Amino acid sequence: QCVNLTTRTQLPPAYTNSFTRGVYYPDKVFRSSVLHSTQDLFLPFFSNVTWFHAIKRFDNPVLPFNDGVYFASTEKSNIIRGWIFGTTLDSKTQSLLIVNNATNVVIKVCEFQFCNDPFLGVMESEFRVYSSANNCTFEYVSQPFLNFKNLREFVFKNIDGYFKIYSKHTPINLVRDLPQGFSALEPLVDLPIGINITRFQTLLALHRSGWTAGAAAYYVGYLQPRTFLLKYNENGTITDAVDCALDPLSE
Amino acid sequence: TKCTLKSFTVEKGIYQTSNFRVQPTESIVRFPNITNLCPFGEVFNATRFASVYAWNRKRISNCVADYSVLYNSASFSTFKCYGVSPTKLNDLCFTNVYADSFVIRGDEVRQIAPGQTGKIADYNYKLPDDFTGCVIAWNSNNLDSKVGGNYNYLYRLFRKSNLKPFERDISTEIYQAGSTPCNGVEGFNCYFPLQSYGFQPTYGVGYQPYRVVVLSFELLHAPATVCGPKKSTNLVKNKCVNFNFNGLTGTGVLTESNKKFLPFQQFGRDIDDTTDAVRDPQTLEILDITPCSFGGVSVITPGTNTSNQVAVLYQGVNCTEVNVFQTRAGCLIGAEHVNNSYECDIPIGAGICASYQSIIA
Amino acid sequence: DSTECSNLLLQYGSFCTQLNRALTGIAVEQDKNTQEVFAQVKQIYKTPPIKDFGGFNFSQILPDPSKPSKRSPIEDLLFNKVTNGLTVLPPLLTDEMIAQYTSALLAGTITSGWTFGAGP
Amino acid sequence: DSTECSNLLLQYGSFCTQLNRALTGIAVEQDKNTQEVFAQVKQIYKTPP
Amino acid sequence: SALGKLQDVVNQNAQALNTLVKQLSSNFGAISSVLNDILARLDPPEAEVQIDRLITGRLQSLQTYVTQQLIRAAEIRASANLAATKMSECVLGQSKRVD
Amino acid sequence: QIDRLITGRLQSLQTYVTQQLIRAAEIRASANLAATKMSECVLGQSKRVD
Numbered sequence A: 001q002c003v004n005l006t007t008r009t010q011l012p013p014a015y016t017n018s019f020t021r022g023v024y025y026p027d028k029v030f031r032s033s034v035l036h037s038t039q040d041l042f043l044p045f046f047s048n049v050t051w052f053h054a055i056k057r058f059d060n061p062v063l064p065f066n067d068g069v070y071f072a073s074t075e076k077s078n079i080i081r082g083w084i085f086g087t088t089l090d091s092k093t094q095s096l097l098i099v100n101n102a103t104n105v106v107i108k109v110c111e112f113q114f115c116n117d118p119f120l121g122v123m124e125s126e127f128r129v130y131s132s133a134n135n136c137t138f139e140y141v142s143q144p145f146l147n148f149k150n151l152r153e154f155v156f157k158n159i160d161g162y163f164k165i166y167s168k169h170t171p172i173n174l175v176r177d178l179p180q181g182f183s184a185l186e187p188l189v190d191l192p193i194g195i196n197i198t199r200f201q202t203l204l205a206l207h208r209s210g211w212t213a214g215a216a217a218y219y220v221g222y223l224q225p226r227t228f229l230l231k232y233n234e235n236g237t238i239t240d241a242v243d244c245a246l247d248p249l250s251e
Numbered sequence B: 001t002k003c004t005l006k007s008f009t010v011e012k013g014i015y016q017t018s019n020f021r022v023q024p025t026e027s028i029v030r031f032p033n034i035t036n037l038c039p040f041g042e043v044f045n046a047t048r049f050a051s052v053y054a055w056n057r058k059r060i061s062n063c064v065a066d067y068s069v070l071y072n073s074a075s076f077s078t079f080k081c082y083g084v085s086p087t088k089l090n091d092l093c094f095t096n097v098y099a100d101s102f103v104i105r106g107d108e109v110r111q112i113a114p115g116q117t118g119k120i121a122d123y124n125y126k127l128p129d130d131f132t133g134c135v136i137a138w139n140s141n142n143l144d145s146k147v148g149g150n151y152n153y154l155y156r157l158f159r160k161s162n163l164k165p166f167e168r169d170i171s172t173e174i175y176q177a178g179s180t181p182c183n184g185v186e187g188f189n190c191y192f193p194l195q196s197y198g199f200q201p202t203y204g205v206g207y208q209p210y211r212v213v214v215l216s217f218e219l220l221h222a223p224a225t226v227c228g229p230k231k232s233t234n235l236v237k238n239k240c241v242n243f244n245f246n247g248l249t250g251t252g253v254l255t256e257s258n259k260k261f262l263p264f265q266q267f268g269r270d271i272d273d274t275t276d277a278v279r280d281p282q283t284l285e286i287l288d289i290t291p292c293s294f295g296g297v298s299v300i301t302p303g304t305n306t307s308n309q310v311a312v313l314y315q316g317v318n319c320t321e322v323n324v325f326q327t328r329a330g331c332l333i334g335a336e337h338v339n340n341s342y343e344c345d346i347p348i349g350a351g352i353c354a355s356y357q358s359i360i361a
Numbered sequence C: 001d002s003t004e005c006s007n008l009l010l011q012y013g014s015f016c017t018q019l020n021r022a023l024t025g026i027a028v029e030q031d032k033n034t035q036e037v038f039a040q041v042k043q044i045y046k047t048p049p050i051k052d053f054g055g056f057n058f059s060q061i062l063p064d065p066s067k068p069s070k071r072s073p074i075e076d077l078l079f080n081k082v083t084n085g086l087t088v089l090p091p092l093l094t095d096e097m098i099a100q101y102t103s104a105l106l107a108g109t110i111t112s113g114w115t116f117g118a119g120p
Numbered sequence D: 001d002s003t004e005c006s007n008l009l010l011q012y013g014s015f016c017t018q019l020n021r022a023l024t025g026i027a028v029e030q031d032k033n034t035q036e037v038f039a040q041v042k043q044i045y046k047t048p049p
Numbered sequence E: 001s002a003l004g005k006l007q008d009v010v011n012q013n014a015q016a017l018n019t020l021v022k023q024l025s026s027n028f029g030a031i032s033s034v035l036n037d038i039l040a041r042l043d044p045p046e047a048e049v050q051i052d053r054l055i056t057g058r059l060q061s062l063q064t065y066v067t068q069q070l071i072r073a074a075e076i077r078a079s080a081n082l083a084a085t086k087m088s089e090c091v092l093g094q095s096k097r098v099d
Numbered sequence F: 001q002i003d004r005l006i007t008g009r010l011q012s013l014q015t016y017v018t019q020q021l022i023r024a025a026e027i028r029a030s031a032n033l034a035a036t037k038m039s040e041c042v043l044g045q046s047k048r049v050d
């Protein structure tokens, strides 16, 4: 079942500063009180990240995946529930679905027929995100990942047929923009998908009383191949990082 | 020392002659806990099987496939593997497993093979010549035969052309054997291609129903996730063993560690990116990897003109891991430690010197 | 620990022997350097118990009896301010003996002038 | 300027960093040598007219 | 920066040792930097070639380390000879040599 | 082909750097001698013969 949303208000996308966000652990290796230089797909410091709103604004477009995706979420009341991954987003090719419903998180790699406007609805009794599921190659059910009160950082990577999902939960009290600080993203789950992904789309949840969009805001950043100098403390968490290509001082 | 110096007379001094290697004693191969086994219960122990024309294909992914349970069973009459050996199935890993299940006659089991010819191969189920997998068949007269006759199993008897490998034909169109059009009615030269089997429990062994499961193993560029169950050797600590933890291998002494890892971290590295800490996959505990006590072997001797007594210094080796005395330089064997202080004759190190008076340090 | 690698490595001859011999030469050279610099006296001199030197104070350079290492305050400060087949051989002379050699040199140059360097 | 050559060269490790470090050490050593030999006075003396 | 001269020697020796360890993680054109992976993933005719590539790369690294250590040893020996000269002439006697 | 050229050029560059280090050591010794002559012959009168 699909429903066209025709009550949106047209608005240009916003842009903002990445500051020192988007850092994640490159590997599953503990390091103590040491500085490690690594070459990987990292998000550039102080970069231009695209800002999307949900307020009548309901921003669910399809964006190019490129080499990786940094997803930042200033979230309250859990509007954002999942993501859409693929190349053509139809039954011709194979697509990846990430959903967090009221009980658990479901990850599926199948040939899905996506709606033009996919969404959920809130008791949660409205699921309108797909119309078909034909050929499945991978299914995985896991534990649930989840003023704006919550900040959710995610990193999605497609390297050698591995899908890396990195995530971090942060307690913030900032009203509008991204807070300035350091928070290294822990690796959450590696998925054996082995599929091509070039486009993605956020999945939101409707509020029904037509429909109402809950207050949420999210940010999209793009990963570029670069070198970071990571600092590991005595307890083994990354507390600070240096972008080697940002300015001559950090170089 | 004479061998190393290429001389039969050795001048007084200390000569580094060899190296002392602690030899590894055991092999410790710890991989993760054996969980999430593959659904072989729903294929082999199914209450009903499909017909050979409409053979069931089940995709097996994201689990651990234990092939020794199937191989060591005595319930299977045929376990013929083509393109791979059964012994290494429990070790190798594959991206996906295709389990094709059907029922055929006793005499038709031979036709489920690459390069064969028959009704089943040409018209019902065709295997490729370059097939990697195993064909498992067993007698099912107890379940699939009834006294009245079990006509729930169908097979294709006629088709215009032979089937392609891994093709399913479920068409029920009237076969045209003659020039005349069938017109949808079964008359002369026009026969229905699907014919029922008539399994009965009083049949011969060549006509009794046999359940056949064919496993197809393919490797694709996607990450292979159907792996065999890697066995785990019990953990041994405080000894120089060869460790293999989740594919990270090496040689070392595994001792208890006070390092508190974060839950996502598995291995530990120092400044020089060498693994000195590790997390055991079976039990989530942290182990320090101390390198085995390799050291230099030096021979301390006076002149051969004076005496043939020698002492051995193991550099940087504790005396419990090899007239035995412990020095900061290493373990000295063959020299009697004295409390008196003299001038240095043969330098040992860390303030220790050796002399001949027996050999004293 | 790879036996095949060692078998292939034996084809290259005595490269390993040359590297080990060069490192051994460097290691004995360091001890020889320390011996040449610090061990220039064969008598261990000590200062008198009463530090009456005509008004000259040497407390900052003489060994401190309170410290277990028997180092001078300046030497203690200097020591505080300095912060796969690999082995580190210990030096032949320990830090205590090097401090003792410096103490002997200081005692000789304070109590005997330059006479101790040229004779009794 | 070949990027493929640099990608293959990165497989060999930090040889280039070592060689650059050694050359940098020699280059600063030459300036240190000149500084040690000629700059032994901090006052620029001048002869009388 | 009073004690920079000793700290430079300590840093150079430690950095050279660190570089020598980090050269082990380089494959030197082979498929992997681990001998076990090559021995387990390839047959002996090609594993011999890959192991040979690792052997020549590591041997070149070790020769480079030993050569630079020898040069530094020569420099330290010269400095120690100078220090022994200062010990003999400045401490054990009064020197008329200017500066 | 690039592997052969890289190993040859790397060996050449390592040889050049080693020769430069040895020559730099020789020049450093000569410069230390020159500084000693500057201190003892120019800034004072030396009793050392020759």
Ligand SMILES: *[C@@H]1O[C@H](CO)[C@@H](O[C@@H]2O[C@H](CO)[C@@H](O)[C@H](O)[C@H]2NC(C)=O)[C@H](O)[C@H]1NC(C)=O
Pocket: A002, A003, A004, A116, A117
């Ligand atoms: C919501 O709008 C989309 C956008 O037009 C509709 O998608 C079209 O569906 C028709 C159906 O035959 C196709 O011919 C068009 O090519 C589609 N266009 C795109 C851009 O996808 C969608 O069908 C609408 N939803 C419903 C339920 O009608």
Ligand SMILES: *[C@@H]1O[C@H](CO)[C@@H](O[C@@H]2O[C@H](CO)[C@@H](O)[C@H](O)[C@H]2NC(C)=O)[C@H](O)[C@H]1NC(C)=O
Pocket: C051, C057, C058, C059, C060
């Ligand atoms: C020699 O100098 C030392 C150190 O400068 C003098 O020791 C000081 O004595 C005063 C007087 O009690 C104390 O307040 C200082 O704390 C002492 N300094 C130290 C480092 O202990 C010493 O008195 C001087 N004279 C003699 C004869 O030793």
Ligand SMILES: *[C@@H]1O[C@H](CO)[C@@H](O)[C@H](O)[C@H]1NC(C)=O
Pocket: A015, A016, A048
């Ligand atoms: C971000 O990009 C937009 C257009 O893509 C541009 O108008 C804006 O100035 C950019 N911001 C920065 C800080 O460069």
Ligand SMILES: *[C@@H]1O[C@H](CO)[C@@H](O)[C@H](O)[C@H]1NC(C)=O
Pocket: A101, A102, A103, A104, A106, A124
């Ligand atoms: C969430 O989705 C899973 C997968 O289909 C399902 O088992 C579960 O019942 C769903 N929960 C809700 C509340 O819809």
Ligand SMILES: *[C@@H]1O[C@H](CO)[C@@H](O)[C@H](O)[C@H]1NC(C)=O
Pocket: A111, A134, A135
């Ligand atoms: C994919 O699905 C279509 C229709 O559902 C089917 O005809 C086709 O055979 C399937 N292909 C694979 C590889 O599963």
Ligand SMILES: *[C@@H]1O[C@H](CO)[C@@H](O)[C@H](O)[C@H]1NC(C)=O
Pocket: A087, A088, A196, A197, A198
């Ligand atoms: C992935 O998809 C993009 C867009 O459809 C295509 O251009 C590219 O060739 C694909 N890559 C692979 C390896 O299939």
Ligand SMILES: *[C@@H]1O[C@H](CO)[C@@H](O)[C@H](O)[C@H]1NC(C)=O
Pocket: A233, A234, A235
């Ligand atoms: C490590 O954590 C402990 C408590 O878990 C804390 O007291 C300590 O300050 C931390 N150390 C660092 C370097 O952050």
Ligand SMILES: *[C@@H]1O[C@H](CO)[C@@H](O)[C@H](O)[C@H]1NC(C)=O
Pocket: B040, B041, B044, B045, B075
């Ligand atoms: C299937 O049935 C047999 C016979 O009872 C039993 O031994 C076996 O454990 C069952 N399961 C499998 C996976 O073979």
Ligand SMILES: *[C@@H]1O[C@H](CO)[C@@H](O)[C@H](O)[C@H]1NC(C)=O
Pocket: B033, B281, B282, B283, B284
């Ligand atoms: C692994 O299984 C053993 C018992 O076989 C159990 O004691 C242990 O807690 C398990 N470990 C994990 C991480 O599941």
